[PDB]
């Protein structure tokens, strides 16, 4: 029915709104978490990087110069964008224009040409002709020695005192001047000017010396004596011109000098960036211990310079690196010597330095003076040969140094320096300085690194002695056989030992949680390049192959990795896609906690029972709660969608799918709320535990997704028991579809199936947890109230159960319901109102909002609802509070009145009331009575109560039920007439009155007497009128004569007719309290067994997590390093097809061995041989699409790609790269073999194909969603290097040999060794064939395994037909050696998250027993125990001490248990007194300390069972904060060691320091010898003492703060109940077993109220409370509410006990809220108040037959009694007051008798004013 659902929604939203506290937090919490997440996002901006290619790295197998260039130049993996020249499929290489390479090539070619230029022989022959044809013909400035055939004046001239000229007349201080002039002025054609201007001594001698030069022609054209000599001169001219052409074309020495002077250009040279630029230009293209102090400061400067630390640490292991060696057999020694010789090819400088030193004097002597030197002097000075020089030098291309060469410096003298200073002297000094610098730089580099040592232990110790010396590179270990130089194993496996800090960790084969990226960081990620491991592997494999096969080198291995495409990374986005369920379910867990609080609060107030009683079937109210909870949850889902769609958080989101998924999850979580709400009662505790349980439900998703083991039906069956796991699966699928936007439909279907199953389970568990009634005959006539009483058995419960108790047919009675319907309840339920004991407040929904809501639910709007206000106008007049204080909670007192008024809504015609009045009796009860009388005196009413005073005052027909069967029924006087005890007369000596009353009338008798009163019983049935009329007058006369004060009259109250018809004391109290605690510990299984067991399982789970977890410091793994990891395939490209060696390699690859070592029986252990896959050339069919064959061939074969990758800048920011839209190039042919489909990329561009294939495979993985990881790890491409290389090695060696033959061959081992080393170095660069290897650092150890496999293939192809390639093979491992002291200590003090988690779990487990103590203390603290002991004279200090002692006992016992569970483990419990006793005392002190800390919590908290969870959460938070504080360091540690007051945090810190100290001790003892460290050694004692002292302070403060209901012990047996209640106090000593029995003797129930386990309904609880009230004899006993509660017969028995206790005499004090009992028991005297302070006597008279006679009865009542009042009057019955109440009862009684016996009347009774009305008047 829609209106009732609408009203339910209205009330739910009123609950959500009016409190105005929960709703604000509800709205803000999702907002708060979103603000935090946005802060995190803006703290982690996306990082976008372009695709990058990596420059090729050269291994030692390649040229040594490329190797050095690679280690120095591309040591950073720069990420050049475009494909580098080395990435091309053809010839590899990057350092083509490098200056060093140009220098080396120029030097080699010039050396080859110089000895083959046909020059040396040419000048040798020219000199021989000079010394043969012209012989000694020397023309020096003053020495013209000429030996010719006298052709051109072939005569000798000498320079003596006199000028000698043996030609003609000499003619002869006019002689030295011309000598000096000739010494100075001699040139090509200056003779005529010389002799024409030779000072002033001409004329006399000028003729001879000016005519001789004419004949001599200054040797201009003279050199033409013979044709052969002229030809020799011409060929020498040509040869030297060509030599000059070459030495100018090289042009690299000038550049070398340029950078050399640039380094030292100025004194204060700038080395910030110019030095680095110059270095990079020279080597590549534009894009501690003290051995020698010079080297020490050089390397200090090198490492201290900016932007050089990485290169410094890459170079240091190479120039002071050291190699170790295990084997010692002659063959493996030969292999190691081959490695040594391969390395030593670079050791060519020391010999170069020695040769420079040796040859500098020779070169200097040759230059200073030589016949050829003079020949070249005179050759470059002429008129004709100079033109030949000019045309030759500028012949090929050009020469700009012609003039400089012509006029170069000569040893004769210095010409000039004003213009420029650049001469051969400068070149000589510069080269000498450079050679010296080279010597000084190189001598710091150790040459030899050769040391063979047999035993591995010695290898490890020497490695230690080297690492601690800062001098070590690596070591190699083989597995050989007995000493033998031949028959070396054909399948050799080896391991490499080297520092962990310079190698990739061998523990993991992958990166774990894969993330997109190139991962090419050399500082810490790519450790195989700068650590030298790859170089070690290359050299060892090269030596092995060379020794085995014996062939030459002819092989160059290079390294490259795939260019990872352009991408934008958001690790934050990955974290969101992984764990946004956590945040959204945090919002929803707070929401469900709020909803759980609301629903459990509604249930606890018993409002569900009220709703069930009146209409409101379970299904419809459940649906109303359903919708009310959905509304806010759907709003939260909608705002979550809005926020995620916008703000650049989760774009590419389809609103429909996300919204429907969120809605279904909202429905499911609301259902989970309904499930977890089905077994809870306490509101706040229920909300907290619902939050905790939902959080626990969420946890296992992480482990399920991480392990993902045996995926299949297991996932669905497990999700059928858990919603958040299914939601997380759906979220991961949505994140998957985001990138390219098990089955979602199947997940939703099983989610709905789970929803329905959970709903039906909830229903099952919820199910499992004139009225006439014909039964042995109740009749409730229309009109007037109808009471209902009963004591034995149900009596009342059965009636409510049958009428509305979910027991429609019956409850075990006759099958007759009543109301002549018996079938349909809805109509009467609309017409029926029920007011049970529990009230209806509905939180702060005003006070009258309940009225309108109930009226609308039952009645209708408009007219009907209007009635409420007018009836409200009669209900209570409180308009000021109505308009001001609407809430009912602050309106205290009328809550019962409000409930009964709400019962009078709609049809208030068959209303039923159960104990309508309960509280402050007088005013509230009178108001309820007036309300009932003035509202519903129209039709049937049912009323049930136990006070039995409401029944008498109310005008109603009482009904008495004893055992279901009716006992009596009718009006008060009606039933009293036939079943009423005598007529009570009270007065306030005794024998005188006794004989005055008894003798006058025999029927009178005594019943009971107590001080200051006397009661008598006069039966009225037998004879009343005569006795009274003759008795009271004389009673009053005697009272006047005697000392009696007054008297009064009472009738048979309803209860009796009901019953008949139906210092050592301190130790004593301490031991008593300890006995209580021991007894409660023994019993109360649910409160202590769990507390003792679940800490044990928590410690056990901590133990298993700490044990099963693999060690975190175990780096070495002995990985066998196979080229497979799980399953994959690679590619082999036959680039540069020339059929020169490459075919051999490829056919060796394509054999039974395949790639590596899969021979014999499959030597690799894990992968097994698994020989499968037909060796076949084949490919899968290509798709048709758009005829890609020629579509992709449209002028696009080598350089361009079939498609492009769109920039992922802003339109799409996906982690992968833009998909081209096609499958790249057509799939090349594949090779099926060795269980992996190899690929071939012959004649392919490679780089683009690699990127596109990577994109395709990652897309396929995203489709299948196998936790996407990189598949292809690399490959290799064969081919041939550049053919531009200079002639082969043999040519260079032969040229060096002929050079040795020339230039005074020296057999000493100084020049021959140098030239041999230089030849070997030059020949090393030769590479007949070369290969390139593709790798990727993402797959760890791929580099090493690929080197292994490629070198194995090279070995296989190099076999000389000896046998099958299968037997030949190689293997390579890596194994970091045992760590040293420093890093072992450092890792022993690591974060050790295992230690943190175990400490947190153990402290969390142990922080519970104090919680048990606190909950026990608080539950006994609520006005039950504390004040009880106060009344007992406890001096609470001793009680606190006893509780303290018991708490520590009941902690140490769990302490012993938990230490036993640790004893189950071994390491944590060491045998001696260093680890076990410290831990035991640690736990004992933690118990001693934590429990006093939380004692104050037992004061502020007002409700038990929630302090448990509250303190648990606080302890968890404190432990977590301590753990993170421990993790703050990873900057003052002292501040950490200052927060002692947090004992839990301190104890956790002590646990972790103990663990780390034990680890340090064990590792130190294992590694070497050390002193035993004690746990307390200068650390433990101080902190334990300070912790104990702080506990003392906390105990003191809590005690001083302490200084500045019924007490029933729960889960306690009747025996022990009474036992302690006897031992409570009273100094029983040995009477302990008596006084308690004495107590029972007053209260009886030796067995019925005793031996009973637990506690029973309030009756026995109050019985025991009153029994324990009178522990002994006190002067007074105060009783507040002596019997309030369920009182079938407890009233009479308790009253008898109280009046007996008064009989012994205790002056009991009563201040109960039940007036009738208090003033019927207590005596100032009640009789005096009700006689003198009361109103007139109440008269009730009964009339039969016809009512008319009511007219005269009142008439004379107003005549004889002018002062009279009437309060009640209906057909045939009426009531009178007569306020006068004078002349004693005698006169009025007699006159009424003599009148009404005459008129018609038959029955009457006169009573004293209602015993409570006297106070009501006040």
PDB file of N, CA, C and O in Angstrom, residues 699-750:
ATOM      1  N   UNK A 699      38.969  -6.852   2.965  1.00  0.00           N
ATOM      2  CA  UNK A 699      40.374  -7.284   2.925  1.00  0.00           C
ATOM      3  C   UNK A 699      40.672  -8.388   1.911  1.00  0.00           C
ATOM      4  O   UNK A 699      41.459  -8.163   0.983  1.00  0.00           O
ATOM      5  N   UNK A 700      40.078  -9.579   2.038  1.00  0.00           N
ATOM      6  CA  UNK A 700      40.563 -10.729   1.251  1.00  0.00           C
ATOM      7  C   UNK A 700      40.591 -10.504  -0.256  1.00  0.00           C
ATOM      8  O   UNK A 700      41.156 -11.342  -0.972  1.00  0.00           O
ATOM      9  N   UNK A 701      40.014  -9.412  -0.761  1.00  0.00           N
ATOM     10  CA  UNK A 701      40.103  -9.138  -2.192  1.00  0.00           C
ATOM     11  C   UNK A 701      41.551  -8.970  -2.630  1.00  0.00           C
ATOM     12  O   UNK A 701      41.937  -9.428  -3.714  1.00  0.00           O
ATOM     13  N   UNK A 702      42.369  -8.308  -1.809  1.00  0.00           N
ATOM     14  CA  UNK A 702      43.758  -8.063  -2.187  1.00  0.00           C
ATOM     15  C   UNK A 702      44.504  -9.382  -2.347  1.00  0.00           C
ATOM     16  O   UNK A 702      45.216  -9.596  -3.336  1.00  0.00           O
ATOM     17  N   UNK A 703      44.343 -10.294  -1.386  1.00  0.00           N
ATOM     18  CA  UNK A 703      45.041 -11.572  -1.480  1.00  0.00           C
ATOM     19  C   UNK A 703      44.478 -12.418  -2.615  1.00  0.00           C
ATOM     20  O   UNK A 703      45.232 -13.119  -3.304  1.00  0.00           O
ATOM     21  N   UNK A 704      43.164 -12.351  -2.844  1.00  0.00           N
ATOM     22  CA  UNK A 704      42.575 -13.116  -3.938  1.00  0.00           C
ATOM     23  C   UNK A 704      43.121 -12.657  -5.285  1.00  0.00           C
ATOM     24  O   UNK A 704      43.465 -13.484  -6.138  1.00  0.00           O
ATOM     25  N   UNK A 705      43.209 -11.342  -5.494  1.00  0.00           N
ATOM     26  CA  UNK A 705      43.708 -10.834  -6.769  1.00  0.00           C
ATOM     27  C   UNK A 705      45.207 -11.087  -6.899  1.00  0.00           C
ATOM     28  O   UNK A 705      45.697 -11.431  -7.982  1.00  0.00           O
ATOM     29  N   UNK A 706      45.961 -10.922  -5.808  1.00  0.00           N
ATOM     30  CA  UNK A 706      47.409 -11.092  -5.884  1.00  0.00           C
ATOM     31  C   UNK A 706      47.781 -12.541  -6.173  1.00  0.00           C
ATOM     32  O   UNK A 706      48.559 -12.822  -7.091  1.00  0.00           O
ATOM     33  N   UNK A 707      47.233 -13.480  -5.396  1.00  0.00           N
ATOM     34  CA  UNK A 707      47.585 -14.883  -5.592  1.00  0.00           C
ATOM     35  C   UNK A 707      47.010 -15.415  -6.898  1.00  0.00           C
ATOM     36  O   UNK A 707      47.726 -16.036  -7.693  1.00  0.00           O
ATOM     37  N   UNK A 708      45.724 -15.170  -7.140  1.00  0.00           N
ATOM     38  CA  UNK A 708      45.035 -15.598  -8.359  1.00  0.00           C
ATOM     39  C   UNK A 708      45.483 -16.994  -8.787  1.00  0.00           C
ATOM     40  O   UNK A 708      45.858 -17.238  -9.935  1.00  0.00           O
ATOM     41  N   UNK A 709      45.439 -17.923  -7.836  1.00  0.00           N
ATOM     42  CA  UNK A 709      45.856 -19.299  -8.061  1.00  0.00           C
ATOM     43  C   UNK A 709      44.639 -20.176  -8.320  1.00  0.00           C
ATOM     44  O   UNK A 709      43.592 -20.009  -7.687  1.00  0.00           O
ATOM     45  N   UNK A 710      44.785 -21.117  -9.254  1.00  0.00           N
ATOM     46  CA  UNK A 710      43.696 -22.016  -9.629  1.00  0.00           C
ATOM     47  C   UNK A 710      42.460 -21.224 -10.047  1.00  0.00           C
ATOM     48  O   UNK A 710      41.338 -21.496  -9.614  1.00  0.00           O
ATOM     49  N   UNK A 711      42.674 -20.219 -10.900  1.00  0.00           N
ATOM     50  CA  UNK A 711      41.570 -19.385 -11.359  1.00  0.00           C
ATOM     51  C   UNK A 711      40.594 -20.231 -12.161  1.00  0.00           C
ATOM     52  O   UNK A 711      40.990 -21.006 -13.040  1.00  0.00           O
ATOM     53  N   UNK A 712      39.307 -20.084 -11.858  1.00  0.00           N
ATOM     54  CA  UNK A 712      38.270 -20.845 -12.524  1.00  0.00           C
ATOM     55  C   UNK A 712      36.957 -20.778 -11.774  1.00  0.00           C
ATOM     56  O   UNK A 712      36.518 -19.695 -11.379  1.00  0.00           O
ATOM     57  N   UNK A 713      36.317 -21.932 -11.566  1.00  0.00           N
ATOM     58  CA  UNK A 713      35.097 -21.962 -10.768  1.00  0.00           C
ATOM     59  C   UNK A 713      35.348 -21.508  -9.336  1.00  0.00           C
ATOM     60  O   UNK A 713      34.410 -21.060  -8.663  1.00  0.00           O
ATOM     61  N   UNK A 714      36.595 -21.601  -8.866  1.00  0.00           N
ATOM     62  CA  UNK A 714      36.914 -21.153  -7.516  1.00  0.00           C
ATOM     63  C   UNK A 714      36.574 -19.680  -7.334  1.00  0.00           C
ATOM     64  O   UNK A 714      36.008 -19.288  -6.306  1.00  0.00           O
ATOM     65  N   UNK A 715      36.904 -18.849  -8.326  1.00  0.00           N
ATOM     66  CA  UNK A 715      36.636 -17.420  -8.214  1.00  0.00           C
ATOM     67  C   UNK A 715      35.146 -17.154  -8.050  1.00  0.00           C
ATOM     68  O   UNK A 715      34.736 -16.371  -7.185  1.00  0.00           O
ATOM     69  N   UNK A 716      34.316 -17.803  -8.869  1.00  0.00           N
ATOM     70  CA  UNK A 716      32.878 -17.559  -8.792  1.00  0.00           C
ATOM     71  C   UNK A 716      32.292 -18.083  -7.486  1.00  0.00           C
ATOM     72  O   UNK A 716      31.464 -17.410  -6.861  1.00  0.00           O
ATOM     73  N   UNK A 717      32.702 -19.278  -7.051  1.00  0.00           N
ATOM     74  CA  UNK A 717      32.145 -19.812  -5.811  1.00  0.00           C
ATOM     75  C   UNK A 717      32.562 -18.951  -4.624  1.00  0.00           C
ATOM     76  O   UNK A 717      31.790 -18.766  -3.675  1.00  0.00           O
ATOM     77  N   UNK A 718      33.783 -18.408  -4.651  1.00  0.00           N
ATOM     78  CA  UNK A 718      34.226 -17.550  -3.557  1.00  0.00           C
ATOM     79  C   UNK A 718      33.514 -16.203  -3.590  1.00  0.00           C
ATOM     80  O   UNK A 718      33.152 -15.661  -2.540  1.00  0.00           O
ATOM     81  N   UNK A 719      33.304 -15.645  -4.786  1.00  0.00           N
ATOM     82  CA  UNK A 719      32.566 -14.392  -4.893  1.00  0.00           C
ATOM     83  C   UNK A 719      31.112 -14.568  -4.481  1.00  0.00           C
ATOM     84  O   UNK A 719      30.476 -13.610  -4.028  1.00  0.00           O
ATOM     85  N   UNK A 720      30.569 -15.778  -4.632  1.00  0.00           N
ATOM     86  CA  UNK A 720      29.216 -16.043  -4.159  1.00  0.00           C
ATOM     87  C   UNK A 720      29.107 -15.890  -2.648  1.00  0.00           C
ATOM     88  O   UNK A 720      27.991 -15.790  -2.125  1.00  0.00           O
ATOM     89  N   UNK A 721      30.234 -15.883  -1.939  1.00  0.00           N
ATOM     90  CA  UNK A 721      30.265 -15.647  -0.503  1.00  0.00           C
ATOM     91  C   UNK A 721      30.830 -14.275  -0.148  1.00  0.00           C
ATOM     92  O   UNK A 721      31.016 -13.983   1.038  1.00  0.00           O
ATOM     93  N   UNK A 722      31.100 -13.428  -1.139  1.00  0.00           N
ATOM     94  CA  UNK A 722      31.720 -12.131  -0.873  1.00  0.00           C
ATOM     95  C   UNK A 722      31.379 -11.181  -2.010  1.00  0.00           C
ATOM     96  O   UNK A 722      31.640 -11.493  -3.176  1.00  0.00           O
ATOM     97  N   UNK A 723      30.795 -10.030  -1.676  1.00  0.00           N
ATOM     98  CA  UNK A 723      30.424  -9.014  -2.658  1.00  0.00           C
ATOM     99  C   UNK A 723      31.615  -8.162  -3.096  1.00  0.00           C
ATOM    100  O   UNK A 723      31.837  -7.991  -4.305  1.00  0.00           O
ATOM    101  N   UNK A 724      32.392  -7.596  -2.164  1.00  0.00           N
ATOM    102  CA  UNK A 724      33.487  -6.706  -2.587  1.00  0.00           C
ATOM    103  C   UNK A 724      34.484  -7.355  -3.530  1.00  0.00           C
ATOM    104  O   UNK A 724      35.062  -6.653  -4.364  1.00  0.00           O
ATOM    105  N   UNK A 725      34.719  -8.665  -3.430  1.00  0.00           N
ATOM    106  CA  UNK A 725      35.630  -9.311  -4.374  1.00  0.00           C
ATOM    107  C   UNK A 725      35.064  -9.243  -5.788  1.00  0.00           C
ATOM    108  O   UNK A 725      35.784  -8.945  -6.751  1.00  0.00           O
ATOM    109  N   UNK A 726      33.764  -9.513  -5.936  1.00  0.00           N
ATOM    110  CA  UNK A 726      33.132  -9.399  -7.247  1.00  0.00           C
ATOM    111  C   UNK A 726      33.170  -7.961  -7.747  1.00  0.00           C
ATOM    112  O   UNK A 726      33.414  -7.712  -8.935  1.00  0.00           O
ATOM    113  N   UNK A 727      32.928  -6.998  -6.855  1.00  0.00           N
ATOM    114  CA  UNK A 727      32.998  -5.599  -7.266  1.00  0.00           C
ATOM    115  C   UNK A 727      34.403  -5.233  -7.727  1.00  0.00           C
ATOM    116  O   UNK A 727      34.569  -4.486  -8.695  1.00  0.00           O
ATOM    117  N   UNK A 728      35.425  -5.728  -7.030  1.00  0.00           N
ATOM    118  CA  UNK A 728      36.790  -5.460  -7.445  1.00  0.00           C
ATOM    119  C   UNK A 728      37.117  -6.083  -8.788  1.00  0.00           C
ATOM    120  O   UNK A 728      37.817  -5.483  -9.607  1.00  0.00           O
ATOM    121  N   UNK A 729      36.623  -7.299  -9.030  1.00  0.00           N
ATOM    122  CA  UNK A 729      36.801  -7.913 -10.343  1.00  0.00           C
ATOM    123  C   UNK A 729      36.158  -7.053 -11.427  1.00  0.00           C
ATOM    124  O   UNK A 729      36.755  -6.809 -12.484  1.00  0.00           O
ATOM    125  N   UNK A 730      34.939  -6.577 -11.172  1.00  0.00           N
ATOM    126  CA  UNK A 730      34.281  -5.707 -12.133  1.00  0.00           C
ATOM    127  C   UNK A 730      35.035  -4.410 -12.354  1.00  0.00           C
ATOM    128  O   UNK A 730      35.121  -3.912 -13.478  1.00  0.00           O
ATOM    129  N   UNK A 731      35.587  -3.841 -11.280  1.00  0.00           N
ATOM    130  CA  UNK A 731      36.362  -2.611 -11.403  1.00  0.00           C
ATOM    131  C   UNK A 731      37.620  -2.830 -12.231  1.00  0.00           C
ATOM    132  O   UNK A 731      37.985  -1.984 -13.055  1.00  0.00           O
ATOM    133  N   UNK A 732      38.307  -3.953 -12.016  1.00  0.00           N
ATOM    134  CA  UNK A 732      39.482  -4.255 -12.825  1.00  0.00           C
ATOM    135  C   UNK A 732      39.110  -4.454 -14.286  1.00  0.00           C
ATOM    136  O   UNK A 732      39.841  -4.008 -15.178  1.00  0.00           O
ATOM    137  N   UNK A 733      37.981  -5.113 -14.556  1.00  0.00           N
ATOM    138  CA  UNK A 733      37.538  -5.265 -15.939  1.00  0.00           C
ATOM    139  C   UNK A 733      37.210  -3.913 -16.565  1.00  0.00           C
ATOM    140  O   UNK A 733      37.511  -3.673 -17.740  1.00  0.00           O
ATOM    141  N   UNK A 734      36.578  -3.021 -15.799  1.00  0.00           N
ATOM    142  CA  UNK A 734      36.294  -1.681 -16.304  1.00  0.00           C
ATOM    143  C   UNK A 734      37.581  -0.919 -16.598  1.00  0.00           C
ATOM    144  O   UNK A 734      37.681  -0.220 -17.613  1.00  0.00           O
ATOM    145  N   UNK A 735      38.575  -1.038 -15.716  1.00  0.00           N
ATOM    146  CA  UNK A 735      39.862  -0.398 -15.968  1.00  0.00           C
ATOM    147  C   UNK A 735      40.511  -0.962 -17.224  1.00  0.00           C
ATOM    148  O   UNK A 735      41.122  -0.223 -18.006  1.00  0.00           O
ATOM    149  N   UNK A 736      40.397  -2.275 -17.429  1.00  0.00           N
ATOM    150  CA  UNK A 736      40.878  -2.882 -18.666  1.00  0.00           C
ATOM    151  C   UNK A 736      40.200  -2.258 -19.878  1.00  0.00           C
ATOM    152  O   UNK A 736      40.867  -1.808 -20.817  1.00  0.00           O
ATOM    153  N   UNK A 737      38.866  -2.224 -19.874  1.00  0.00           N
ATOM    154  CA  UNK A 737      38.131  -1.682 -21.011  1.00  0.00           C
ATOM    155  C   UNK A 737      38.389  -0.193 -21.207  1.00  0.00           C
ATOM    156  O   UNK A 737      38.183   0.318 -22.313  1.00  0.00           O
ATOM    157  N   UNK A 738      38.831   0.509 -20.163  1.00  0.00           N
ATOM    158  CA  UNK A 738      39.162   1.923 -20.311  1.00  0.00           C
ATOM    159  C   UNK A 738      40.289   2.118 -21.318  1.00  0.00           C
ATOM    160  O   UNK A 738      40.242   3.040 -22.142  1.00  0.00           O
ATOM    161  N   UNK A 739      41.313   1.265 -21.264  1.00  0.00           N
ATOM    162  CA  UNK A 739      42.479   1.461 -22.121  1.00  0.00           C
ATOM    163  C   UNK A 739      42.135   1.261 -23.593  1.00  0.00           C
ATOM    164  O   UNK A 739      42.584   2.034 -24.448  1.00  0.00           O
ATOM    165  N   UNK A 740      41.346   0.233 -23.911  1.00  0.00           N
ATOM    166  CA  UNK A 740      40.971  -0.068 -25.289  1.00  0.00           C
ATOM    167  C   UNK A 740      39.468   0.054 -25.525  1.00  0.00           C
ATOM    168  O   UNK A 740      38.925  -0.632 -26.397  1.00  0.00           O
ATOM    169  N   UNK A 741      38.788   0.911 -24.772  1.00  0.00           N
ATOM    170  CA  UNK A 741      37.361   1.109 -24.949  1.00  0.00           C
ATOM    171  C   UNK A 741      37.035   2.006 -26.127  1.00  0.00           C
ATOM    172  O   UNK A 741      37.303   1.659 -27.277  1.00  0.00           O
ATOM    173  N   UNK A 742      34.146 -14.167 -15.401  1.00  0.00           N
ATOM    174  CA  UNK A 742      35.041 -13.237 -16.079  1.00  0.00           C
ATOM    175  C   UNK A 742      34.244 -12.128 -16.757  1.00  0.00           C
ATOM    176  O   UNK A 742      34.518 -10.944 -16.562  1.00  0.00           O
ATOM    177  N   UNK A 743      33.254 -12.521 -17.554  1.00  0.00           N
ATOM    178  CA  UNK A 743      32.444 -11.545 -18.270  1.00  0.00           C
ATOM    179  C   UNK A 743      31.672 -10.674 -17.289  1.00  0.00           C
ATOM    180  O   UNK A 743      31.264 -11.126 -16.216  1.00  0.00           O
ATOM    181  N   UNK A 744      31.473  -9.408 -17.665  1.00  0.00           N
ATOM    182  CA  UNK A 744      30.719  -8.498 -16.809  1.00  0.00           C
ATOM    183  C   UNK A 744      29.291  -8.991 -16.611  1.00  0.00           C
ATOM    184  O   UNK A 744      28.750  -8.918 -15.502  1.00  0.00           O
ATOM    185  N   UNK A 745      28.664  -9.492 -17.677  1.00  0.00           N
ATOM    186  CA  UNK A 745      27.301  -9.998 -17.554  1.00  0.00           C
ATOM    187  C   UNK A 745      27.239 -11.185 -16.600  1.00  0.00           C
ATOM    188  O   UNK A 745      26.332 -11.270 -15.764  1.00  0.00           O
ATOM    189  N   UNK A 746      28.200 -12.107 -16.700  1.00  0.00           N
ATOM    190  CA  UNK A 746      28.226 -13.244 -15.785  1.00  0.00           C
ATOM    191  C   UNK A 746      28.471 -12.785 -14.354  1.00  0.00           C
ATOM    192  O   UNK A 746      27.869 -13.314 -13.410  1.00  0.00           O
ATOM    193  N   UNK A 747      29.364 -11.809 -14.171  1.00  0.00           N
ATOM    194  CA  UNK A 747      29.622 -11.291 -12.834  1.00  0.00           C
ATOM    195  C   UNK A 747      28.363 -10.683 -12.234  1.00  0.00           C
ATOM    196  O   UNK A 747      28.046 -10.925 -11.065  1.00  0.00           O
ATOM    197  N   UNK A 748      27.619  -9.904 -13.021  1.00  0.00           N
ATOM    198  CA  UNK A 748      26.398  -9.290 -12.508  1.00  0.00           C
ATOM    199  C   UNK A 748      25.336 -10.350 -12.236  1.00  0.00           C
ATOM    200  O   UNK A 748      24.581 -10.253 -11.260  1.00  0.00           O
ATOM    201  N   UNK A 749      25.255 -11.376 -13.085  1.00  0.00           N
ATOM    202  CA  UNK A 749      24.271 -12.432 -12.871  1.00  0.00           C
ATOM    203  C   UNK A 749      24.551 -13.188 -11.578  1.00  0.00           C
ATOM    204  O   UNK A 749      23.643 -13.413 -10.766  1.00  0.00           O
ATOM    205  N   UNK A 750      25.806 -13.589 -11.364  1.00  0.00           N
ATOM    206  CA  UNK A 750      26.147 -14.271 -10.120  1.00  0.00           C
ATOM    207  C   UNK A 750      26.027 -13.334  -8.925  1.00  0.00           C
ATOM    208  O   UNK A 750      25.709 -13.783  -7.821  1.00  0.00           O
TER     209      UNK A 750
END
